[PDB]
Amino acid sequence: EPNVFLIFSHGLQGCLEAQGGQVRVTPACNTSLPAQRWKWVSRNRLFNLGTMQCLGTGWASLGMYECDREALNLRWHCRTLGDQLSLLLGARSGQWRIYGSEEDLCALPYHEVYTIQGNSHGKPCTIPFKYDNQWFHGCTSTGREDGHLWCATTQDYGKDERWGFCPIKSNDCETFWDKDQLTDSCYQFNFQSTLSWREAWASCEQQGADLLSITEIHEQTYINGLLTGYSSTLWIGLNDLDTSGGWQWSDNSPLKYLNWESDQPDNPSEENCGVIRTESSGGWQNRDCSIALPYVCKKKPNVECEPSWQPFQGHCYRLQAEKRSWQESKKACLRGGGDLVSIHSMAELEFITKQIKQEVEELWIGLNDLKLQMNFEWSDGSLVSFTHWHPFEPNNFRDSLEDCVTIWGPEGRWNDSPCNQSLPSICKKA
């Protein structure tokens, strides 16, 4: 019902129809009628709800045939379909569009829907498929008692007995999820499935979810945690993929907590997607995004300033041209009754970079990991709600221990560097 649509011709002023094995175009289009209702399916086949059959011709013997029929041509490219109909039917501006909205017929293609459990290793729903000589164009609950929506991963479940569960967008977390009662976070460890990162990213999105994000040390300890006793290597949605940026979370979460393996990450150019390993007791490694590994999903239900200080929104900001270590830079802020600058918004980053930093190369900012290594916090106890690393940053967490963060160049993105280094700094108080 969501991605089912009606084909329409302006040149012929009528929608496509199917009757038995013959195709007619009728000017009076009613969405109520299923014989006029179509949807895209696998193998570039076009599926009809009313007839529960596919459109095809012969290698101009056009009509409607069973999808299983291999000897005919049942394949259609949406981008040419409009042009083809005009040829085989004569719709002699004269273009073919979706009935409701003037959208191309490629507006709602068939998305591979990835399974979750079952003897099928996450393999996508084969649509259509045949159980007990009945054609299905989606997931059905018939053949179960628990009522859970399931589908097959082959042309014939009677012959192959290959099945899987269906993804369900929801705001509860039951049967398919474990729940952390401290944070209302629901996690899903798909040990058996084997999908790419891009494929896995999809399978999570399909469930009103996304790939894992470990934003706090508590999350890692909890997960460490649920992995206990098991053997696997799982995708986590830690990517290097933003060409113009460093590491980030697939859910645009702030990268404040790290748990890389000792000699990791190596090959940040070829291996752009991160994984969690049980063997390292929760440690992170980066691998090739093309490889097929299990994955983990995560979802959550439901001013007048001082004289030398320029203002932005709630707070006042000032530049210290004097060069110092990170720590001695923070002290000079205290002497001013403020702390090292803290950034919580992109707007705040632009101002600080455009108005305050100006044409100075590098600057210390409030971010560090001195309290606990690998866990970054702002100096003024502010929440880390924003992360804007430069490409392949951060990288100095295992080499320096006392790892501190700087703004670098015009763009305003960040490098991490030992607090050894002497640079200018920016202060912020209200």
From Swiss-Prot:
Keyword hit for Glycoprotein: yes
Keyword hit for Protease: no
Glycosylation: residue positions: N30, N302
Modification(s) after translation: N-glycosylated.
Cell compartment(s), UniProt: Membrane
GO terms, molecular function: carbohydrate binding; collagen binding; signaling receptor activity
Fibronectin type-II domain span: 120-168
Residue span, Ricin B-type lectin domain: 2-105
Disulfide-bond pairs as recorded: C15-C29, C54-C67, C125-C151, C139-C166, C204-C297, C273-C289, C333-C427, C404-C419
Tissue localization of expression: Ubiquitous with low expression in brain, placenta, lung, kidney, pancreas, spleen, thymus and colon. Expressed in endothelial cells, fibroblasts and macrophages. Highly expressed in fetal lung and kidney.
GO CC annotation: focal adhesion; membrane
Subunit and partners: Interacts with C-terminal region of type I collagen/COL1A1. Interacts directly with PLAUR/UPAR and PLAU/pro-UPA to form a tri-molecular complex. Interacts with collagen V.
Entry text on domains: C-type lectin domains 3 to 8 are not required for calcium-dependent binding of mannose, fucose and N-acetylglucosamine. C-type lectin domain 2 is responsible for sugar-binding in a calcium-dependent manner. Fibronectin type-II domain mediates collagen-binding.
Function: May play a role as endocytotic lectin receptor displaying calcium-dependent lectin activity. Internalizes glycosylated ligands from the extracellular space for release in an endosomal compartment via clathrin-mediated endocytosis. May be involved in plasminogen activation system controlling the extracellular level of PLAUR/PLAU, and thus may regulate protease activity at the cell surface. May contribute to cellular uptake, remodeling and degradation of extracellular collagen matrices.
Protein name: C-type mannose receptor 2
Designated gene of the protein: MRC2
Full-length numbering of the shown residues: 40 to 507 of 1479
